A paper describes a structure:
Epidermal growth factor receptor (EGFR) is a receptor tyrosine kinase (RTK) and a member of the ERBB subfamily of growth factor receptors (EGFR/ERBB1, HER2/ERBB2, HER3/ERBB3, and HER4/ERBB4).1 Ligand binding to the extracellular domain of EGFR promotes formation of homo- and heterodimers, followed by tyrosine autophosphorylation, and activation of several downstream signal transduction pathways in control of cell proliferation, apoptosis, and cell death, among other cellular processes. EGFR ex20ins mutations constitute a diverse set of in-frame insertion or duplication mutations of 1–7 amino acids located between positions 762 and 774 of the EGFR kinase domain. Ex20ins mutations primarily occur at the C-terminal end of the αC-helix. Mechanistically, it is hypothesized that ex20ins mutations “push” and “lock” the αC-helix of the kinase into an in-state active conformation that promotes ligand-independent EGFR dimerization, receptor activation, the constitutive activation of downstream signaling pathways, and oncogenesis.
Gratifyingly, we observed ethyl methoxy 23 exhibited a 21- to 35-fold improvement in ex20ins potency relative to 4 with ∼15-fold selectivity over WT-EGFR. To further understand the ex20ins mutant potency and selectivity vs WT-EGFR observed for 23, X-ray cocrystal structures of 23 with the EGFR ex20insNPG mutant and WT proteins were obtained. The insNPG X-ray structure confirmed 23 binds to the αC-helix-in conformation of the protein in the catalytic active site where it makes several key interactions, including those predicted for 1. The 3-F pyridyl N of 23 forms a critical hydrogen bond with the backbone NH of Met793. Next, the lactam of 23 forms a hydrogen bond network with catalytic Lys745 and Asp855 of the DFG motif. Importantly, this hydrogen bond network also stabilizes the αC-helix-in conformation of the mutant via a salt bridge with the αC-helix (Glu762). Next, the lactam carbonyl also forms a key intramolecular hydrogen bond with the aniline NH, positioning the aryl ring alongside the Thr790 gatekeeper residue, where the 2-OMe and 3-Cl substituents occupy a hydrophobic pocket formed by the Leu788 and Met766. The lipophilic nature and asymmetric shape of the gatekeeper pocket helps rationalize the previously investigated aniline moiety SAR. Furthermore, the aniline ring itself forms a cation−π interaction with the catalytic Lys745. Inspection of the EGFR exon20insNPG X-ray cocrystal structure with 23 suggested two vectors from which to engage C797 with a covalent warhead (e.g., acrylamide), namely via the hinge binder or the core lactam.
Numbering used by the authors: 701 to 747, 755 to 770, 770A, 770B, 770C, 771 to 990, 1015 to 1020
Write the structure that this text describes.
């Protein structure tokens, strides 16, 4: 059962703006619980009220048992707007992190992040949840060795006798969506596997924009012609074939998140065999459009 903890605005202090975009506005602060005096660093989101409360319901529904690689909602705050509260991730989003530390990320970190995103997505698949927005921008970095999936804005829960979600005319990310989602607005856990492949391609290219220069309306025709995202220079054939298996026309032929945990975990045990990065031993660490 989903339960929300209504937190008072007087409990939050030192609110500073982290960023803004399609997600709305994300801030950072210090949550002092009532009675307790432990200053917990937290993040606050804003944007209309109908949309942010759907996100809170989705996050609260999948909170028990919970997964270490999935962001969990601490509670909500009722100021002039409805705000979401979660544990702060000090190192920000992974898309910016891979673009900032281009020359310091080793093969072990890239493969472990792929394992962790697949562990989080497999947990969401078990809780009948289709994320519908898996991208490097929606992956946060708690510490360089630990990542979490975020932004349950487009996420939808599936009923017991429901294996797919049909969207209406809302804005959606075309360059991360599967071909069936662009053509027929159909969203399954296998459509999230396509987005997982695009997210893996983003990490392997250190934050390259997918299909750069190509407009969103030309993507369906490009994917029907057999064209896919290119092989990143650091990827061996085994890593690139996983990405290409995530982008197959038949959604059931694509890999499963439980299979991607095993495949990338095997690769993480011998990382230099599967990714070729210069000076790997020396390294050390401490969009949306209307469909038609
Ligand atoms: C600043 O924007 C980065 C990407 C942005 C993209 N979309 C997000 O949803 C989000 C982002 N940052 C953080 C975030 C979280 C935790 N610590 C730091 C951070 F920045 C997000 N989650 C988030 C923020 C506040 C409350 C809740 Cl319940 C959240 O989970 C949905």
């Amino acid at each position: 059962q989903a339960l929300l903890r209504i937190l008072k605005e007087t409990e939050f202090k030192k609110i500073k703006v982290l960023g803004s975009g399609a997600f709305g506005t994300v801030y950072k602060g210090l949550w002092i619980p009532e009675g307790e005096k432990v200053k917990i660093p937290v993040a606050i989101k804003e944007l209309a009220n109908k949309e942010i409360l759907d996100e809170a319901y989705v996050m609260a529904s999948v909170d028990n048992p919970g997964n270490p690689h999935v962001c969990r909602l601490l509670g909500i705050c009722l100021t002039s707007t409805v705000q979401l509260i979660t544990q702060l991730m000090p190192f920000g989003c992974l898309l910016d992190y891979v673009r900032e530390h281009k020359d310091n990320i080793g093969s072990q970190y890239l493969l472990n992040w792929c394992v962790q995103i697949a562990k989080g997505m497999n947990y969401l698949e078990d809780r009948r949840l289709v994320h519908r927005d898996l991208a490097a921008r929606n992956v946060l970095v708690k510490t360089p060795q630990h990542v979490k999936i975020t932004d349950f804005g487009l996420a939808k829960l599936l009923g017991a006798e429901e294996k797919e979600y049909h969207a209406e005319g809302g804005k959606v990310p075309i360059k991360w969506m599967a071909l069936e989602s662009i053509l027929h607005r159909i969203y399954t856990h296998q459509s999230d596997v396509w987005s997982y492949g695009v997210t893996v391609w983003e990490l392997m290219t250190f934050g390259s924009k997918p299909y750069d220069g190509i407009p969103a309306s030309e993507i369906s025709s490009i994917l029907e012609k057999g064209e896919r995202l290119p092989q990143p220079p650091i990827c061996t054939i085994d890593v690139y074939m996983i990405m290409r298996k995530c982008w197959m026309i038949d959604a059931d032929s694509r890999p499963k998140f439980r299979e991607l945990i095993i495949e990338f975990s095997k690769m993480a045990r011998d990382p230099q065999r599967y990714l070729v990065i210069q000076g790997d031993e020396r390294m050390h660490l401490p969009e949306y459009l209307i469909p038609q």
